[PDB]
Structures are given as C-alpha cells and as structure tokens.
Paper text:
[name] is a [name]+ channel conserved in organisms ranging from prokaryotes to eukaryotes, including humans, and plays an important role in [name]+ homeostasis. The previously determined crystal structures of [name] from [name] revealed the homodimeric architecture of [name], consisting of transmembrane (TM) and cytoplasmic domains connected via a long soluble helix, named the “plug”. In the full-length [name] structure in the presence of [name]+ ions, the binding of multiple [name]+ ions at the subunit interfaces of the cytoplasmic domain appears to stabilize the closed conformation of [name] by fixing the orientation of the plug helices to close the ion-conducting pore. [name] forms a symmetric dimer, and each subunit is composed of 5 TM helices.
Here, we determined the cryo-electron microscopy (cryo-EM) structure of the [name]-Fab complex in the absence of [name]+ ions. To determine the structure of [name] in the absence of [name]+ or other divalent cations, the full-length [name]-Fab705 complex was reconstituted in PMAL-C8 amphipol and subjected to cryo-EM single-particle analysis. A 3D reconstruction of the cryo-EM images was performed to reach an overall resolution of 3.7 Å, with C2 symmetry imposed, and the cryo-EM density of the TM domain was clear enough to build an atomic model. Notably, we did not detect the cryo-EM density of the cytoplasmic domain of [name]. The Fab705 molecules are bound to the cytoplasmic side of the [name] TM domain, and this binding is mediated mainly by electrostatic interactions and hydrogen bonds, primarily involving the residues in the TM2 to TM3 linker and the TM4 to TM5 linker. Furthermore, in the patch clamp recording, when we tested a high concentration of MgCl2 (20 mM MgCl2) in the bath solution after the addition of Fab705, we did not observe channel opening, as similarly observed with a high concentration of MgCl2 in the absence of Fab705. These results demonstrate that Fab705 binds to [name]+-free [name] but not to [name] with high [name]+ concentrations and neither positively nor negatively modulate channel opening at 0 mM [name]+. In our cryo-EM structure, the ion-conducting pore is wide open on the cytoplasmic side but still closed on the periplasmic side, indicating that the pore is still nonconductive. Consistent with the wider opening of the ion-conducting pore on the cytoplasmic side, the TM helices, including the pore-forming TM2 and TM5 helices, are located in exterior positions with respect to the center of the ion-conducting pore under [name]+-free conditions. In our structure, the structural changes in the TM domain occur mainly at the TM2 and TM5 helices, and the glycine residues in the TM2 and TM5 helices enable the kink motions of the TM2 and TM5 helices for cytoplasmic pore opening. Therefore, our cryo-EM structure of [name] may represent a preopening state of [name] under low-[name]+ conditions, where the pore is partially opened on the cytoplasmic side due to loss of the tight interactions with the plug helices.
Residue numbers in the entry:
A (entry chain F), F (entry chain D): 1 to 30, 31A, 32B, 33C, 34D, 35E, 36 to 216
B (entry chain E), E (entry chain C): 1 to 52, 53A, 54 to 83, 84A, 85B, 86C, 87 to 104, 105A, ...
C (entry chain A), D (entry chain B): 271 to 448
C-alpha cells in the first residue's frame, strides 16, 4: 500500500550528539479514527526490533528520554538528544493505518570516526588451491571508512563481472572501521590462463581508485 | 518484561511447507493479536500477517495471501505460521510480535513485543563438509612492515561456522565476515592482520568448527 | 445445554435466569411509558404502534449489531474503525428509516389517525436512526470494554433500543401533539 | 455480506429487504391492538406493559426456539420426538410463567395499578406459555415443512409471539376489566 | 428405483482405519439421513450409525461409539464411514441405508433403500497361494453303486476363489462350500457325486482360480 | 437397548402356503409420538435387505400383496399368503423407537422338502496331503434335510474337539437339500499315529447316529 521510505539510509553520527532521522510517507498516514500511526522501532545489531516511538508524538515504556519523535501529516522525524552507545542499530519507522502495515527502509546508526583508507590486499589462490580442483582468488579491503565502497574486479587489467561475491562486516567495536571481502570464484583453467588479477576499489577518500594486482 | 519466544533455526527444501511456532508468555495470549513480520537477508522488514487469537482469524498482507497461513491454539498459547510453497525469496528471518489488544486498551496499535527470529533458509540442504583453504599472502611476503593473513571457508552448510585463529588465542586484527550464500552453498572468509616480524616467525593456523558435519579442520598458512 | 435428558426444573433454571435478566429492562420500558402517560391519555392511538416501533428499533439493532460483529470477527473492520463505520451507519440509518417510516405512515393512514401521521413519520425515522447507530457502536463499545460482542450484544442492543425507541417515540409525541 | 467495501445503498438494500417483512408483521400487531381500543380507552395503564409483555413473549420464543434448534441439529431430538418435548415445554412454560409473572406483578403493584394486577398476572403466564409452546413447536413444524429451522425461526417466532402477546393480553384485559 | 451404491470389497489388517464410502444417487442426498448398519458373518444385523447430511452430525449406537465415525459431503453426495481400531470382531459386511427424511415426509422412519455391501475383513493381509488337495475316496473305491468325489482348497486369501469340475463341464452333483475362515487363512471345499461306473473310467479333475495370486491349479483325483 | 428377538429361527414351509413369522420385542415399541415402529426387512439370499413392512400395519411400495403384517404392542407378526419363489430369504423385523434401532435375530425361509438321510463319506487325506506339508482329513455330509445337523468327530473311535471347521451350504436349488463339509486339520504324527477316524453325524431322521470310519 503506502510505499513508505526513510532518508538517509546511513546516518554517520558521533557518540554524544544529536541525530535526526527523517521518515516521509507516500500518502498521509492519518486514520479514519484520526491519529498518526507512525510507530518507530529500533533493531539493535543482531536482535529483534523493539518498539521505540508509537503514535509519533508519544513514547514507549522503558525508553530513555534520549529519543524524541515529532512531526505529523506525511513527514515525520525521530531525533536523538545525545547518541549513546546503547542506541546504535537500525531505526524502522512503520505505519499502521493502511493495511498492509508496511515498514520503512530502515536507517543504520554508525559512528562518525575519522575517514581512513582501505588496506587493500589481493590474496591469490592458496597452494592448496593449486591442488584443489577449484580456483578462488579473494581480495580483502580492510580497515576503511565509511561504508560506501565498491570493488572493481579487473582480470589481466580487464574488468570482469561474473560469479562475484561480496560480504561487508558490520562496524568494528574497537575503532569503528569497516572491512570488505571480495572473492572471485572461477574454474581452474581460467585461473591458469590469466596472469594479472587487478583488485580495484573506489573509495571516497582516495582521489584515484586504489588497486592491487599480482602476476602469477 | 513480556518474553515472546518462538521456534529455533529452520531449514527447508524448496517447495516444502514449514510451520513456524511462536509461543506467548507473560500475557493473556487470548487477548492480544500476534503480528507476523519477516526480515530479509539484512534489509527492511515486511509485515506478513496479523492473527487474532480469540477469533482465530487473521488479516493478510497482499503480497503474502496464500504464501502464508496463520493459526493459533488458545490453550497451547502458541502462534503458528505455516509457509506454503516457499520459494528462494523466502530465505529470511520471521518475527512474531504481539501488537494489538483485543480490548484495544493500549493506545498504540502495532508492535508491543517481538519474537527472537526463526531463520528460514531455502536450499537443497546438502550438509556438505566445510572445505577450508589457507589464504597465503600475495607473493614471497613483500615488505611494508604490516602484512595481513587471510583464511577462506567455501562449500559448507548451514550458516553457523566458527572460525578462530590459533584456536581463539590471537584474535587481534581479526576480521570475520558474514556467511554469504552462493548457489546453495555458503562461503565464510576471514582475515588477521599482524606485523611482518611476527610472521612467518610465529606459527599461525586456521581452524573451523562446523556442527552439522562435526568437522574440525586445522591448517597452518604457508608462505608462497 | 444437552436437552433431552434435562427435566423441566433443569431447563427452567437457566431459562428463568436469562428471562429475569430481560424482564428488568421490560420493567424500565414500562416505567418510561408510565411517565409519558400524559400523552397516551390525550390520544389513545399512540399505544397502537408501540409494538411495531419497538420491533423495528430492536430489530435494526439485532441486525446492525450482527452485521458489525460478523465483520469485526473476520478482521474486516479493525476496532479503530468506529469513526469510519459511524459515517456509514448514520447514512444507512437515514436511508433505511426514510423507507421504514414511509411504509409505516401508509399503515397509520390506512388505520385512519391523521393526527398520528406526523408523529409516527418522525418517530420511526428517529428510532431506526438512533437504533442503527446504537446497534453499530454496541459491538465496538463492547469489544473496547473487553467483552466479546457476539456474546452479550443480542439482548443488550434489543434493550438499549426498545428503551430509546419508547423514549424517542413518546418525546416526539409530546412535541407534536401536546 | 462483506462489510467495509459495501456502500450505504447496498447495505440499505439488504437490510430493508429484511426489515420490510418484519415491519409487515409489526403492522399486523398494530392492527391487533387497534381492534381492542375499547379497553385501552377504558384504562390507559394497559399500554404501559405492552412492550414488557411482548419482550418477554418474543424472548421466551427466541430462547425455546434456539434451545430446540441446537437439540435438533445435534440429533438429540427427532421430528417424531415432538410429543415428548411438548409435555416438557408445557411444564417448563408453566414453571416459567409463574416465575416471570411473580415479578411483573411486583412491578405493576410498585407502579400502583391495583386494578391491573390480575390481568397482568394472568397475561404474563398465558403469554410465556403460548409463546414457549409456539417457540418449541416452531422448529418441528419448520423442519416438517422442509426448511432448516435455524434460518427462519429467529424472526418467525418473534412475530408469531408478539402477535399473541397482544391477542392474549388484550383478551384477558377484556375478560378481567370490561 | 433409487440406486444406492457404495464402495467395493475391502481388505484391512488389525489396528488399521478404513473409510467405507457410500454414494447416493436418485434422491436429494442433502435431505435424507443415511443409516449405517453392519451384517456379521451370516447372522443378524446391527445398526451402527445414522448420519444426517444436512447438519453433518450423527447419532451413534452405544456399542459403536468411537469405533466408528460418520461424515458426509453434500456436494460429493457420498456418505463416509471411518472405522477406527477395527478388531477381528469387525469382520462383517457394512450396509449404508437411506432411512429418514429431513422433512420427515415419508411416514415410516427406518430403512428406505440399502447399499450393496462392503465386505470388510480384519484378518492379516497375507496373500497366499490356494494349495489344492484332490480328495480321493475312502479306500480302493469300495462298492455301493454311488460314490462321490471331493476336493479341498486350504490356506488362501482373500475369499473369492472359483472352483469348477473338469473346467465347468460336469457341474452335476457338485457341492461348493463357503470359504470359511481359519486363523487368517480361508478354506474352500468341494464335492462332486457320480456313479461308480463313471469313475475312475472318466478322468475327473479339479481346478481353482485365485485372482490375488493369479493361480490356476489343475489336479485330478487318483484312486487310492 | 431393546434386546429384540424372533421365533422361530428356521421356518420350513412349502411353495404356495402361508407362513407366519413371529416378532416379540423386549419392551414396548410404542413411541412417545405413538405409532408402532416395527419395520420388516427381507434379505434375499446374497443381497441387501430391502424394506418390506413399515409401521407394522402398513406395507412398502413395490411389495406384492402376499405379505401381511399385523399385531401391535410388543408381539408382532408377518404372515405370508402364498409362499412364492421370489419371497425366500431371511426376514428381519427391526425397530426404530429406542436408540439404538436394534434388529431382530432374523429367520430364514427354507422349503419343506421330504426329509432325507445324509450321504456321509469320510475322505482320508489325499496322497498329495501325505507329502504336502499339512494333514487334514475331511468328512462330507451330502444331500440331507433339514438344517439341524452336527458332526461328532471321533479319532480312533474317541471324540476330538480341536481345530475343527464346519461350513454348511445354503439350500440347494434343485431338490432343496443341505450338505455339510467337516474338515479336521491336524499335525502329521497325530495323523501318522492313529488309524481310525470315526466321522459321526447325528441326524433328526436317523434313529442311531450315522457314522463313517476308515482304517489307514
């Protein structure tokens, strides 16, 4: 029904600042009964989303006063007073007027650490790979920031977009950096034909994209 | 306060029919409607049913009418979801959440308390043993005073596979990555970052622990 | 209750329980009419239509309440839709009183009480109206009090509609005759 | 009928389709009262208890009828088992008329119409008797005609009992007052 | 007139649960109550249920409450009996019989029209070949001018086994006896009576035809 | 409930005579409604019982006038005018007042042919039976009358009552006589130990019991 949405999808803030999460409906979520069903849920990393703000003005029980939910009509907003370490996660603003009670896209709550450059490191297939029957070259993108990153998988210097997997870790609990794994599954022969494996990553901090390639 | 506990981890074949159980506790289950909502593989939620225990009838999302069937048992205090013909798009986590009073003496009207998550995974559940691979450095341990060591785990099932470094001794500079899916077989990767002086001076090993295959692979990374 | 085994006293227990709960509401309607006796004495045709007016009031009740309950017990109407079913039951109450009273005024005319035509015409509409609304917001009020509406709506709307059918018919009679 | 989609016109259509029949029966009851105006003019307290007597009548109806419908739809009784429920519903009708008239005469006395006590006391018994019996032999007569007696009993016993609630009450009034 | 047809022959093993189907035809199945009555192994009947299609509910014999469950389907016009935990004492023929109007516009009240019989045997499902033993005369064909010849068929299952004499040619003086049961295996016997001149002058043979074993044993009697 | 019954259990009549079947209930089969539910069914040999007389006075449709049902109270009777060949079978008188609607014991309709003596014939186990894996001597009682018969199984002249089976054919369609098969299953050595097998049959016609014995 109401193709509801949130902006932004990532919210880089600090610990002890004020964070404002927008929530813009598609059509007005005022009920025939007539009160603003724009409930807000917080899903701490690896938990279940528990209710935070209901009927956007009000607040749920057990909820610290750090959270402030306001707005009405179609544009609603949840604002934090001081971002604490127990408030990080993803924030869903849902609705309950028009069946189906759709949910928002949800936005995360990262930490605005210092911007860092990735420690990119191509990892050619192991010695056991040489006698494994399969080939899987992997390129690690470690200890960077922010989340926005993308690998460019170039083979022999030429781009390739087949059989690619990518998994990003969540925010680190020591320095709050992100790391990215880029594996490349391919048959033995395609590994034995080609020599160069250009792992390219385009980060917003580096001017030129950072690359890594080895010659077998 | 109220503890809402549902079934454990779930595994199914495509085209099957799985019946997720959600038991209520701490409140009168007869007088609060249970809401079923699914969370995709790290994405937004999607509300997929609202079962009314007292009347036993439910209202259904448009996208899930037929692909789901909610029933309950007042005496058993359990809320039951029965997925039907669950395709690959149903590979998600399925929360049940008490969310609306029968007397409507609550004010708000959606999501009081939630379950814990019943990971529902669709695949050809071939419980393949985890083939694990020691990711050696680039070539010949080039200089730089900061060289990292990786480790790959491809071809296993299901998701939970522990990876430790020297059996949980050196967990500094470690990075463990989500068990991503790839055509019915997962792929866990890992990386540890050390100084160029400690390796290959120190014997760094990689070990896994896969329960459903009872496999404990131990190997030490070689310098190429 | 299983029937063929129970004796006359066994039946009588439960049946008198419910019937004596309803005879009290019968008492209060009797008291209302006794209070309004001052217009029944003035014109004695008023009493000729108490049964039909009540059997239309406490019937629009046991029909709207059934309609709302069977649509509230299939999650067709959520409990927060009282204000949206209100502006629908008010409309249907108007559009149904305007025909029930249209037939009953024809009956009154065929009887031959021209002084009764205006009071019956206003009164059947104002009983069907405030019996349809009270039969439609009886299930919401009951389910908001914590009681299953289908249990205690069938007698409750009948009483709450015959009381307020008398209390409207007689009041309109006092306004239109004396 | 699915509710939240239907418009006021369709709702009115169905509900008036039923309420026209019920107000035709109300028309019959109104004519029955109009026939007895000579006693209502003589004493105007008679009209004070038409609603309570009709309620108790058409309530003993819709109670005995829905007590026999269940016992007949769980094979507890059979269509050849009416003469055994007859000598049981007659007994419970007597034992229920006594225990309802014993309260309605109290109401009449507390209101202060001593000349009306005998007729109310006789009439409540004679109505929750010939309404209990007609609510108990209505399911058998319906199922013997060929109709599922759970469909067309709830309104039918109400009409067949509030007709007699006047045709007996007013007759007893004529025998006991004038 | 009205044809009431039910399921065919039935075979079960102890502890099972069989659903005997009785389809109605020629009358409005919704408006007549089906009576279930069982006939034991050549004895009196016993009324074992009365299902009312319109309400779908039934009244039950006291001796059969629980050991039987009657359900119907108005659209399918079939009456269903479901025996539960049927011991060897439930080895009988189970008639369904339309026997009561819903409008009671029939006068009488019992058994208008009956099914055809669903032989239900509780014995163990052991399909066995029908061993044949040509029953020779007493000894040496003693005189008397009237000597008979017999035939025995022991140890087979189920009931229907045809026995003919010289393949259905000489069926004079023949006597075929009911397939009596004996500890989960039947026993058919037969006799033919001839003159002392026709035998052993004419070669008399004995043949059977068991369907579930597809056996045609042909054996001719020898004079002892 | 009403442990209803019939007398007699066998009704030897002729073809073209009048036969009276009694039916004596246990308690009165008059209903609270008040009419005599004593339905009568005829089960022709190897068919299903079709209704013959309902509400004992009346008669069913398609029923020839040969049948006459009368009586009331607790003792009821069905009488035939002229016993035809289409009227043979077994006659059940049921009830429909007291649940469960029990049925009568049922009585057959045989033919009163001339009383005959059985053509008994002991049959020793066949030569195949000697090398078969079983041992079973069988005694035949053929072409006798009436139904009342019983075998006395004597071994070496001494009685035996173990493992006996007996099957009686129905009434023959040529001369309306009965025949009885009496088999005797036994182990090998019990057959190989004993020589004499006295098959004894006690018939209503014969004064002394008719016997048969062979010496192996």
């Amino acid at each position: 029904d109401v193709l509801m949405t949130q902006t932004p999808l990532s919210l880089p803030v600090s610990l002890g600042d004020q964070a404002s999460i927008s929530c813009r409906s598609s059509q007005s979520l005022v009920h025939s009964d007539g009160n603003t069903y724009l409930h807000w849920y917080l899903q701490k990393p690896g938990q279940s989303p528990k209710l935070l703000i209901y009927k956007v003005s009000n607040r749920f029980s057990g909820v610290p006063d750090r959270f402030s939910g306001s707005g009405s009509g179609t544009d609603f907003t949840l604002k934090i007073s001081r971002v604490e370490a127990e408030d990080l996660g993803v924030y869903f603003c849902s609705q309950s007027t028009h069946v189906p009670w759709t949910f928002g896209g949800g936005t995360k709550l990262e930490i605005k650490r210092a911007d860092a450059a990735p420690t990119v490191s191509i990892f050619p297939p192991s010695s056991e790979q040489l006698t494994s029957g399969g080939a899987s070259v992997v390129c690690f993108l470690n200890n960077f920031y922010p989340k926005d990153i993308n690998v460019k998988w170039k083979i022999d210097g030429s781009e390739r977009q087949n059989g690619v997997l990518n998994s990003w870790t969540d925010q680190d609990s020591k320095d709050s950096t992100y790391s990215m794994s880029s594996t490349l599954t391919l048959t033995k022969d395609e590994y034995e034909r080609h020599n160069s494996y250009t792992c390219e990553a385009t980060h917003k901090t580096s001017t030129s994209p950072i690359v890594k390639s080895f010659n077998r | 306060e109220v503890k809402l506990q549902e079934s454990g981890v779930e595994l199914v074949k495509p085209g099957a029919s799985v019946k997720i159980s959600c038991k209520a506790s701490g409140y009168s289950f007869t007088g609060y409607n249970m809401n079923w909502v699914k969370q995709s593989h790290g994405k937004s939620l999607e509300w997929i049913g609202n079962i009314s225990p007292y009347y036993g009838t439910s209202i259904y999302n448009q996208n899930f009418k037929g692909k789901a069937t909610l029933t309950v048992d007042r005496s058993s205090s359990t809320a039951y979801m029965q997925l039907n013909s669950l395709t690959s798009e149903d590979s998600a986590v399925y929360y049940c959440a008490r969310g609306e009073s029968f007397s409507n003496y609550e004010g708000y009207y959606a999501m009081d308390y939630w379950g814990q998550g019943t990971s529902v995974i669709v695949s050809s559940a071939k419980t393949t043993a985890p083939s694990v691979y020691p990711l050696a450095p680039v070539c010949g341990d080039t200089s730089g005073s900061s060289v990292t060591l990786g480790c790959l785990v491809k071809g296993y099932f299901p998701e939970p596979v522990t990876l430790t470094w020297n059996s949980g001794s050196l967990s500094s500079g470690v990075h463990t990555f989500p068990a991503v899916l790839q055509s019915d077989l997962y792929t866990l990767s890992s990386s540890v970052t050390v100084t160029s002086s400690t390796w290959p001076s120190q014997s760094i090993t990689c070990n896994v622990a896969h329960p459903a295959s009872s496999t404990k692979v131990d190997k030490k990374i070689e310098p190429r | 209750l299983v029937y063929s085994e129970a004796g006359p006293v066994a039946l009588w227990l439960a049946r008198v329980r419910w019937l004596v709960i309803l005879i009290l509401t019968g008492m209060v309607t009797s008291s209302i009419l006794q209070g309004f006796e001052s217009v029944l004495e003035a014109v004695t045709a008023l009493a000729f239509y108490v049964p039909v007016l009540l059997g239309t009031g406490g019937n629009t009740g046991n029909q709207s309440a059934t309609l709302i309950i069977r649509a509230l017990a299939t999650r067709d109407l959520d409990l927060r839709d009282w204000r949206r079913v209100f502006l629908k039951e008010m409309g249907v109450g108007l559009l149904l009183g305007l025909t029930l009273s249209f037939l009953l005024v024809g009956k009154v005319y065929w009887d031959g009480h021209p002084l009764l035509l205006p009071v019956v015409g206003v009164s059947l509409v104002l009983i069907v109206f405030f019996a349809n609304l009270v039969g439609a917001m009886l299930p919401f009020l009951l389910r908001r009090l914590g009681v299953d509406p289908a249990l205690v709506s069938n007698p409750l709307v009948a009483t709450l509609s015959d009381v307020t059918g008398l209390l409207i018919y007689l009041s309109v009679a006092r306004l239109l005759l004396e």
